[model samples]
Target: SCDTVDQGYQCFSETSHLWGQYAPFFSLANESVISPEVPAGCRVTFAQVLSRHGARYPTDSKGKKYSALIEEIQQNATTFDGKYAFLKTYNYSLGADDLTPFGEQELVNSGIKFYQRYESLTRNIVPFIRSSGSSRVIASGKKFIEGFQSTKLKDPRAQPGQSSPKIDVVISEASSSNNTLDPGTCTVFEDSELADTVEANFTATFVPSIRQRLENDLSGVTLTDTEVTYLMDMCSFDTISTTKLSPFCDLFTHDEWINYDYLQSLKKYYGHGAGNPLGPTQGVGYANELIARLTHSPVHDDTSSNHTLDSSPATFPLNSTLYADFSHDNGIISILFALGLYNGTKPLSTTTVENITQTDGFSSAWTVPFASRLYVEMMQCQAEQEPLVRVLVNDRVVPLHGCPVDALGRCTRDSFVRGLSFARSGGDWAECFA
Candidate 1:
């Protein structure tokens, strides 16, 4: 199969996570990793970057389901001698919930970009970092730190006083309470059956046609969309797992891939985004913590913040010039809403295929692809008397309203913090029960 590279697989040229959250990391069209240009007299004072973990194998539950489904299909395989030929030899080799090799590299790449863009801002102080203790998240953070620290070694710009800035990482237990990075403590979110139910119904809508279409080509067993989901999930995982195009990627057309990803975003919308009342509620801790970092104060009471960590300056320093935190896709989605970034954007349609390449609502593709980062920069510029703040998802300025943007797209720091209604009103952690 050494000659497989030129096979013209559809996924090789046509696929990207451009429309979904789970695809291998891809850069936004026209995105520039370069930092936003500073106004003539103004300079960057501080920055906070919140990033999603890199590309990883499927989750534990997904792996289990895939294993069961594959065993069923293989046992019934004598009829698969025709068009469904790949399944005869395919086996599930993916490990559950760990960063793939490609995933680790994405984080390293992010760190190098961060170093190039923000090296000047972090020269004086030991940068502070935090990450959830989950396998992939923690591993990505470790790689990023390694990448940043390693990059600094060869730079001629490193003078004696600022050469070896310490980088310390603190781990927030994934299963613990008040975790802004994980949000696992949200009882209402975890215990609720609605998110899964909505996702299943959404799956059924498109799953029917694909199921019958595949059965038309194969002779043995009837296929359900759950099996299709297994294959689709494999499309992403296998592609990243081997750094090669997956056999499953070519099974579905590009349109079907986009549609299935559309279904995924819907689940994200209702479960962690604007559709649910608690969507932003779950993100308040991270937003509040961001405010605290910008203004140099501790996180306020009555939120999901781990008091033990936030209360200590060692773990949660308010005065760091650069801060980085590694988190999950769902956690970042909740925080985006809490900060009022895309709070009122049009809800993505569940029924319509007209806008399948949805140009509306908050884009999970743009926000939380593997290694995706939300960059919040603090600027000291003559454009305003006080510091100005701006945010970007994957290097594109997020059109956060209530503070208008100048040509470079930035808003006043005061207005930026003032606009966070959920955080300003004092986030209530007791709502986990609500």
Candidate 2:
């Protein structure tokens, strides 16, 4: 529960609507009060950022023949007509490109500016900053953040660089098994280990492909992997599939999956016995096991030969701290692993297991539950979050991409407001994140 300081009131004025457009512009056009009831001194300090994948070009945008063909397909698309195109563009080469289109710069700039507004308004209020290890958004944020530090915008709490900002950007490479290159288990926070801000805290590139990417791009690169998985649509038909299991189901049809192997495959994909509905190893069962130990539930047996398996509800704090508190990389990896989205036999990070324990306490195997919990918490939190979007022109708001308000003063807000205009919403994103 959150603390509410003022009873609900109209958080609007004449400027409210106009200012809404200028949101990445911070104005008191609308009025709302911060809650002061739940826990004193518990200000909203940290943000669990779930960024949309950055700007992208259409699959056949520039090619003359391909572009026209894609247009024809899009215009007269059937459920199966466009299937081959999607199948061929498996994310195997997701990390191949590193540049965003010039057209998308404005939106990214607006996003950065909107984030900057928060820095302008609440710089004094916020004490910490955390983000998924994304090169783009994190870098975008830094651009404005640096400006905020330099300008010392509205903040009265600290002077420029009085307290250096500690940025922890997790870097997890997507396992090669699926089209999705998951956030590798290795975590990298910063780069300039020599800077007053903090030294470079990069995740050691343990995944061979990612290491290759880093080696190739001495300069910074794009944040998102090239291959984006839409829900359970892994690149099952790609070359990567043979590395994991045969007769890949990247394009699995429900009707054909009637046998036991299908069930086993499904179970293998989900990490639980297929279709039991109680515990999908990655879903309720995992959550319940943690809760059972935390709450000490008798109905849920706590006895197991393995200590990790037996732990009950008490796993919450431990799980949260390890997975959520540090980085979302572990969470990303777990999701991909659970969904059969890895490319190689060793999608699991044997190398990371050894490295992480040396730096953070605990052995790597113990961190699995923690990682899983963190992933769940992130999804849950994002699902429940009030909608927030930002797109700026010159470190300010733009017309199209801002908060929406209506005549009744009611905000047409959503819980999870992805930054992009064209993206879809709902539980489907759960699997992608997983």
Candidate 3:
């Protein structure tokens, strides 16, 4: 309270971090060299970026659940005091499945980062941007272009034939057949109740105490497990939507947040990530597209990729040094699985957290947080030798599986391209239809 001393101005105990993927933008870099320096005498021949859209309100289906829960709470709870006090005045302010203001900035920041990292590659190339056809995704791509264009001074080393790029959006839907960015529905993946069963069963183990404590705090209220789930969802959504942190966050302890975070991570593990049976299958089209871009060949797969687009150089240009694709989190993670990076992790169950060695081992918080990006580059360091390839996720140089790598996770381009077994031969995509 002393006016003479330095004023902290902010609450020191404000939790300081986000709860997993729900948290806003922070660098996804960890445990790997993040340098963008080209190798000795190497030049980037081609670079591809696949990025997720920025933070958004819950999707239509999830928003319905949130709306229902909010309505129930408003009707059922009369007195609001203590942490629940905010609930009395807190009307739902979220719209469905659109980017928040901060979410828009997220991609802008990413575009600037990419430009800085690849200015040598970025300054002189034609833009071949693509989006997954969701309105949010298209908007994110445009935001990225805006950020990239903000650095508008022409480079001294700029080449001829530079023009503003057109963004092509692949069609998006549950039944979309030829969109590489949006996965076609898989029966096994779509029908699996394993993730839901896992989350609810795990919730039963830890939520009773929280429920009882909340009931004691508020005399007329009794919270169901489903209601509690809504609360956690609200915690993240409200925090992300507003500039201020949500009051709902103060109701739960850090351990509770961790548990909540784990539930989400568990769902991603079995639901969207490598643990899903068709996860890799969903991403093979993009992998083949990557290869085709590097090799200047047509994408031969008839699966998720649009052959009509790939067959034409105008839409699927083989000459661009910069390739950026905007997509969903599911798109990003499935491609990770499809490329066999971050594969072979232990399969998660309701209890597999015990076996995890890293903090956030199975967590989606690090892997596919909103605005996540995966960068793949091809380089030529030696005149006669084949090119070298590397992969970076959210700026961290993640190691690829089934390949030899240097300290920086750089693999021989040929080895890396050929090692993709499913991408080499198109994935078991027919099974998705079956």
Candidate 4:
């Protein structure tokens, strides 16, 4: 097949383009805009921003169980036009878990990127830091703080100084999912208090997607009752595959599924295969709980499921739970609760450090990876609605309501590209998107 620009890439344009008529810059430029729909008269006095990072390897077990990290390595290589090509190509071919040094750097960079949008939107004044005290949560928070205060954050608050924002905190829990609270000692596992609340929450709401997963096998067009029951078992990962849908992660694809080679590579990298993939039968209880939280539910430790899932499920299943302590959920929730062309609002919550311990019966993880930027888009038919309102990067008002546009014009684009030439020591792709 002969190659052409159109064949290789999707078209992006002015009037009607890749992301509809929205100027393409709205989503990009406004990622930090907070959208908390206050209840009529109630103001957000004390905000509780519980949020998890994008995605990461699970703790407890010791083997490569997830595949998204590999996927990311590949994407990074392409985005940079093979600059650090070894990242995925070699790893993918060899089924290795040791990421290219560049891959690790890029991941942290991605986290910085995701965090900056909100920092810019909210004036870089993050107030609190609560997490499970796990290595993943604590490390991510520390990295976030460092990234936010680095050159990127325009008006970042000082760290721990009089004018500094909150330092950090962590919470504990059995699972960071909707079933945060463990079943009562007297209640059956399937009909425990948390399960009852989880069931009730499921009833009062309509996540057609969840219902779909519960109702049907991938071959079937819709959900079936058996599928729904399967979801309740926390064994849904067995049911979920990259081909159909990544229930826990919106970003994973089929290519990332776990296999022999994948497991071997992980084993080689950590020497002990820290990416464990087995399910309930293997006694991966901690990993299972985290999986439930990261993928399906995130309101695990909420003392009152009734209040937390007030018609809303956990925002992010596991990641959110591992994000912050219950007292500091607002910072991340502000953006996660909004809509993009491809994504919409989901349930969210924060677990306490103490509760986290109760679930695992041990301190499982201490920190996790986080994405600083996810090129989210909010696509609506140009024909169906009014244009979105917008604000320019320079604080000027603009009429275009679209995804974030790379509209610095040729002069700016070229200058940026030239600057990037130093980054990779080669001719840059300033004109690629232009």
TM-score (all chains, Cα) for each model: 0.90, 0.27, 0.89, 0.28
Please give the ranking of all candidate structures by lDDT, highest first, separated by commas: 1, 3, 4, 2
Better of 3 and 4 by TM-score: 3
Deviation of model 4 at 160, angstroms: 12
Residue runs of model 3 more than 4 Å from their true location after superposition: 1-18, 33-37, 154-161, 174-176, 185-188, 352-362, 382-384
Q: How close is candidate 3 to the true structure, as a TM-score?
A: 0.89
lDDT of 2 by residue, 1-434 (tens): 11011111112212111111111112211221221111222222222222222222223322333334334434443332232445222233222112133212322333333334334233443223333344543543343344335434444554454453344333333432111113221112112122211111112222234434422432322222211111112222221111232122333333222221122122222221111121112222222232332233422311111234233433222222111122222233233233221212222221222222232211111112111111111111223344222211111111222234222111222421222111221112233223
**What would the per-residue lDDT of candidate 1 be over residues 1-434, giving only the tens digit for each residue?**
22111111124435665337776555442453334455578788988889888888889988998888878777764566544687877877888888988788778877777776777765444568888778788888888877776677666775445544333555556566568866777777677665677778778778788888766666566677778877777777777676367777777888887677777777777788876767777888888888888989878746677778778888888877888889899889888888888744777666654242344335666667788888899888664688888887776666666666566667788878887776777654566786
Q: Count the backbone clashes (under 3 Å) in each candidate.
A: 1, 55, 0, 83
| Candidate 4: worst-modelled 10 consecutive residues by lDDT | 15-24
Name the regions of candidate 1 deviating beyond 4 angstroms: 1-13, 29-41, 81-83, 161-176, 353-361, 427-430
lDDT (10s digit) by residue, model 4, range 1-434? 11111111111211111111111111222222323112233221121223343223323231242334335434433232222233334232222222222223333443344344444233434434444434444554555455444534444453333343333423343343322212111112223133233333433233344555322322223434323322222112222111221122222222221111122122211111111111011112222232233234433222212234323433333322112232111122111111111012111111111222232210111111122221211112223242112222211112121133223111121222222222222111122122
**What is the Å distance of residue 157 in model 4 from its true position?**
10
